Amino acid sequence: AVDPGPELDGGDFALPEGGLDDDRRLRALDAVDEYLTRKRKHLVGYQATQDMQGTALDLARFMPNNINNLGDPFQSGGYKPNTKVVERAVLDYYAKLWHAERPHDPADPESYWGYMLSMGSTEGNMYALWNARDYLSGKALIQPPTARRNPNAHHPVAFYSEDTHYSFAKAVAVLGVETFHAVGLEKYADECPLVDPVTGLRTWPTEVPSRPGPSGLSWDGPGEIDVDALAVLVEFFAAKGHPVFVNLNLGSTFKGAHDDVRAVCERLLPIFERHGLVQREVVYGSCPQTGRPLVDVRRGFWIHVDGALGAGYAPFLRLAAEDPEGYGWTPEAELPEFDFGLRLPTAGHGEVDMVSSIAMSGHKWAGAPWPCGIYMTKVKYQISPPSQPDYIGAPDTTFAGSRNGFSPLILWDHLSRYSYRDQVERIREAQELAAYLERRLTAMERELGVELWPARTPGAVTVRFRKPSAELVAKWSLSSQDVLMVPGDETTRRSYVHVFVMPSVDRAKLDALLAELAEDPVILGA
Amino acid sequence: ELDGGDFALPEGGLDDDRRLRALDAVDEYLTRKRKHLVGYQATQDMQGTALDLARFMPNNINNLGDPFQSGGYKPNTKVVERAVLDYYAKLWHAERPHDPADPESYWGYMLSMGSTEGNMYALWNARDYLSGKALIQPPRRNPNAHHPVAFYSEDTHYSFAKAVAVLGVETFHAVGLEKYADECPLVDPVTGLRTWPTEVPSRPGPSGLSWDGPGEIDVDALAVLVEFFAAKGHPVFVNLNLGSTFKGAHDDVRAVCERLLPIFERHGLVQREVVYGSCPQTGRPLVDVRRGFWIHVDGALGAGYAPFLRLAAEDPEGYGWTPEAELPEFDFGLRLPTAGHGEVDMVSSIAMSGHKWAGAPWPCGIYMTKVKYQISPPSQPDYIGAPDTTFAGSRNGFSPLILWDHLSRYSYRDQVERIREAQELAAYLERRLTAMERELGVELWPARTPGAVTVRFRKPSAELVAKWSLSSQDVLMVPGDETTRRSYVHVFVMPSVDRAKLDALLAELAEDPVILGAP
Numbered sequence A: 001a002v003d004p005g006p007e008l009d010g011g012d013f014a015l016p017e018g019g020l021d022d023d024r025r026l027r028a029l030d031a032v033d034e035y036l037t038r039k040r041k042h043l044v045g046y047q048a049t050q051d052m053q054g055t056a057l058d059l060a061r062f063m064p065n066n067i068n069n070l071g072d073p074f075q076s077g078g079y080k081p082n083t084k085v086v087e088r089a090v091l092d093y094y095a096k097l098w099h100a101e102r103p104h105d106p107a108d109p110e111s112y113w114g115y116m117l118s119m120g121s122t123e124g125n126m127y128a129l130w131n132a133r134d135y136l137s138g139k140a141l142i143q144p145p146t147a148r149r150n151p152n153a154h155h156p157v158a159f160y161s162e163d164t165h166y167s168f169a170k171a172v173a174v175l176g177v178e179t180f181h182a183v184g185l186e187k188y189a190d191e192c193p194l195v196d197p198v199t200g201l202r203t204w205p206t207e208v209p210s211r212p213g214p215s216g217l218s219w220d221g222p223g224e225i226d227v228d229a230l231a232v233l234v235e236f237f238a239a240k241g242h243p244v245f246v247n248l249n250l251g252s253t254f255k256g257a258h259d260d261v262r263a264v265c266e267r268l269l270p271i272f273e274r275h276g277l278v279q280r281e282v283v284y285g286s287c288p289q290t291g292r293p294l295v296d297v298r299r300g301f302w303i304h305v306d307g308a309l310g311a312g313y314a315p316f317l318r319l320a321a322e323d324p325e326g327y328g329w330t331p332e333a334e335l336p337e338f339d340f341g342l343r344l345p346t347a348g349h350g351e352v353d354m355v356s357s358i359a360m361s362g363h364k365w366a367g368a369p370w371p372c373g374i375y376m377t378k379v380k381y382q383i384s385p386p387s388q389p390d391y392i393g394a395p396d397t398t399f400a401g402s403r404n405g406f407s408p409l410i411l412w413d414h415l416s417r418y419s420y421r422d423q424v425e426r427i428r429e430a431q432e433l434a435a436y437l438e439r440r441l442t443a444m445e446r447e448l449g450v451e452l453w454p455a456r457t458p459g460a461v462t463v464r465f466r467k468p469s470a471e472l473v474a475k476w477s478l479s480s481q482d483v484l485m486v487p488g489d490e491t492t493r494r495s496y497v498h499v500f501v502m503p504s505v506d507r508a509k510l511d512a513l514l515a516e517l518a519e520d521p522v523i524l525g526a
Numbered sequence B: 001e002l003d004g005g006d007f008a009l010p011e012g013g014l015d016d017d018r019r020l021r022a023l024d025a026v027d028e029y030l031t032r033k034r035k036h037l038v039g040y041q042a043t044q045d046m047q048g049t050a051l052d053l054a055r056f057m058p059n060n061i062n063n064l065g066d067p068f069q070s071g072g073y074k075p076n077t078k079v080v081e082r083a084v085l086d087y088y089a090k091l092w093h094a095e096r097p098h099d100p101a102d103p104e105s106y107w108g109y110m111l112s113m114g115s116t117e118g119n120m121y122a123l124w125n126a127r128d129y130l131s132g133k134a135l136i137q138p139p140r141r142n143p144n145a146h147h148p149v150a151f152y153s154e155d156t157h158y159s160f161a162k163a164v165a166v167l168g169v170e171t172f173h174a175v176g177l178e179k180y181a182d183e184c185p186l187v188d189p190v191t192g193l194r195t196w197p198t199e200v201p202s203r204p205g206p207s208g209l210s211w212d213g214p215g216e217i218d219v220d221a222l223a224v225l226v227e228f229f230a231a232k233g234h235p236v237f238v239n240l241n242l243g244s245t246f247k248g249a250h251d252d253v254r255a256v257c258e259r260l261l262p263i264f265e266r267h268g269l270v271q272r273e274v275v276y277g278s279c280p281q282t283g284r285p286l287v288d289v290r291r292g293f294w295i296h297v298d299g300a301l302g303a304g305y306a307p308f309l310r311l312a313a314e315d316p317e318g319y320g321w322t323p324e325a326e327l328p329e330f331d332f333g334l335r336l337p338t339a340g341h342g343e344v345d346m347v348s349s350i351a352m353s354g355h356k357w358a359g360a361p362w363p364c365g366i367y368m369t370k371v372k373y374q375i376s377p378p379s380q381p382d383y384i385g386a387p388d389t390t391f392a393g394s395r396n397g398f399s400p401l402i403l404w405d406h407l408s409r410y411s412y413r414d415q416v417e418r419i420r421e422a423q424e425l426a427a428y429l430e431r432r433l434t435a436m437e438r439e440l441g442v443e444l445w446p447a448r449t450p451g452a453v454t455v456r457f458r459k460p461s462a463e464l465v466a467k468w469s470l471s472s473q474d475v476l477m478v479p480g481d482e483t484t485r486r487s488y489v490h491v492f493v494m495p496s497v498d499r500a501k502l503d504a505l506l507a508e509l510a511e512d513p514v515i516l517g518a519p
Helices: A022-042 A053-062 A084-097 A121-137 A166-175 A180-187 A227-239 A261-274 A314-322 A407-417 A420-448 A470-475 A507-517 B016-036 B047-056 B078-091 B115-131 B158-167 B172-179 B219-231 B253-266 B306-314 B399-409 B412-440 B462-467 B499-509
Strands: A112-117 A157-159 A244-249 A280-285 A294-298 A301-306 A355-361 A373-378 A462-466 A480-484 A493-500 B106-111 B149-151 B236-241 B272-278 B285-290 B293-298 B335-337 B343-345 B349-353 B365-370 B454-458 B471-476 B485-492
Touching (some): A022 B399, A053 A407, A053 B047, A084 A407, A112 A407, A121 A166, A121 A355, A121 A373, A166 B158, A227 A261, A261 A301, A420 A507, A470 A507, B078 B399, B106 B115, B106 B399, B115 B158, B115 B293, B115 B365, B149 B172, B172 B219, B219 B253, B236 B253, B253 B293, B253 B335, B412 B454, B462 B499
Parallel strands (some): A244 A301, A301 A355, B149 B236, B236 B293, B293 B349
Antiparallel strands (some): A112 A373, A280 A294, A355 A373, A462 A493, B272 B285, B335 B343, B349 B365
């Protein structure tokens, strides 16, 4: 019933052979600005911070520059208009924040290596899976400067929850990584160790089960991976000799759940030790003359944290949890230890540093005018690139060719403006406002006698509820998801929306949405 | 240069004074380097776009999902992206508008990185299309039918080698070595042995070898290699460089196509029955008719200027310019007669970088193909997305504004002028460099491929290289022999490079110690 306003008219933007005069150009750009401004101010349904006024003032001066961070961030190449000194400072910030070992040093296998992304986490998760595929499959590594048989040994299997973002399923297809489901169905069709809770049959699920909700099924659950189910699936493939890739979601896309990274790691480490995956000889080729195995020693598992969203705020929440009286806040929910600092003892290999890589999107929690982000891992995981006759070192070891050198400035400017304490306050207000929205939605159910189906995973900055009219969804940019309440049965479909409480979402904005929700024709219904 | 100490981000943040001093240092560095950059194919003047578009910096714009679908993230510029894709579709003789019901209509999207993304996408799309993965619109005993083979010249950008490895696409060299090790149909010009070359040979220069050649693919050699694999049942992927990275060469796309079409017709690759699955009930093999070849044009650079040069070539008195060099027909308009006197549209995809010829403040560009090549994505319930063929995450919605603002400022005639001026200035630089060799009595090895906007020559001092951002390439004059190494640089004459800049560079080259000390 409310108005989202007009969309842009294609006729205003058509680019003729003769060009557009200045008046037609400005009218068009004004139309874009009017549209974008109205939508930016009402966006509450996506995990994207919208207020960046300071960054625009600070950094508009750089727009005349064709900046290019071509090549490795730690190497000084020929394209001199680059921001790699800035990129390194941002990577250093996050390396400390995620308890990685800094500075980066090609001589120290445990030091971090990472780079800033020219897309968002889509690029970072692709790189992770490329890096993990090759590492676990035995491709040659960048060896630092100084100072069996098992037919499944080169066949990594990938594991992740049903809450994993779809762009992650694309990356599996792009890179030819095999999921446990595909390998299950191809090689082990009748050997599925899980019983399906709907049918009671041992059918291979398409992803690792997420934890169930009041229904007994994942659709109304928290969206966190079922650690028990994961451990059963990993054991199965690990016992057969496959190396193992596990993606864990730190701030899942629809429910904002945090997979319990520490619990997963504690549960899986003994499985990896029992099956020889902590340290295992890997054939990475063969030099001619009766030397059929060239062999180095690697770990046979790779744990990746998809922190597209949550890697930007979780360290700050956990900083508060460690010193609640210092920050004047005790977070309601515990967020798992997830970073490069997570180390666990073993029966006979010493302490193991569990996480191999993390991705984060800069345009999610921090906010940016375009997609950007960070991929980070350790020097010891770096793959050797394809050989050529130009003889300086490894500088193409990134996904992108040309690389965005403006994004470093954006995130540098952001991080320079907020202290740790300021970052704690941002995640505090978002957490408290998400709790408030959930309280207000349940009060509205009681006031009006309408069902809203509100749900919020403890510790998430998102709240899901019944989808209102298309016009309201369009006005406030509410992301939608349909769920089937009983898998395979289309008559049990429910339509949800969610609101993400980012730092640019305040009380007033939420109260204005709630006021329209209360008069919405679908919500009031019939 | 720039001190890292100035940019360290402390736990407590930086105050407004430290922040501004650091940004000023960056801006002073960048401004000095931008105004002297002449060694990379990146246009450096975009003062108008900055004035027009800095107002958008406060918006988190996201073009998530397909450019031709609505989505839930309403702060997007998809209407603008479409205008831009429409402009390039016209320019490249693609069929407009995009229409999912018309197999011949274009589909494309604007890239969030540069052509690295576009070439990756092309090879992904080709791999799946040629290997029998399911399409969006469908309405043995060849054991090689699902094993595509990739071909490209030795001048191909290193981005392709990376994409090949990322996607598991197998090159002719890898397949040759694995399956057909003793069957190489080419003789190596240095050794005389039938050793599989690592890439398709480029054309020779005065040396008899490719290092001093123009950097264009050897069409004969490509034809012999393609026939070899095509005869064995493999589908075929061919990348053609339209403005190669170091020499700015243009592979003769029309000649390649003319040459390869007979090969594809002889070996059943124009219309090939492809097994994409089998039905659940009885397991009968499901079949769709596809082409068994894919020609991609890597136009990272040259898809931005080549249509304007060819416009002049077609009406030289109308534009007041006859280009010296002929650039090949390369785009979606390229159609050849079949044996049965029908027509076949030869090119399947084109990539272009917006930050190369046009200029932009960050990497961007275009991937374009046709509706009939679109692959069906993985089967799972998305969040407010219909069929979706992108990488499925966030997409840069600011780059559409950058390129829209650029394209709107210039007529076809103005774009013709930009390529004219760059061609004439590249010719000028080559004349000046040869004059300098005679004036100073030194060897500068200058070279310029006819029709290229780049000129290569002997690498000067590190100081000069660093000031003018000159890109460097080493060559071995006899492949394998380390004592034959030569170090070249190049200059790219982009629209932001004028005569004054080239004259200032030349005056410094004439007094450079490495140039004067040149044995």
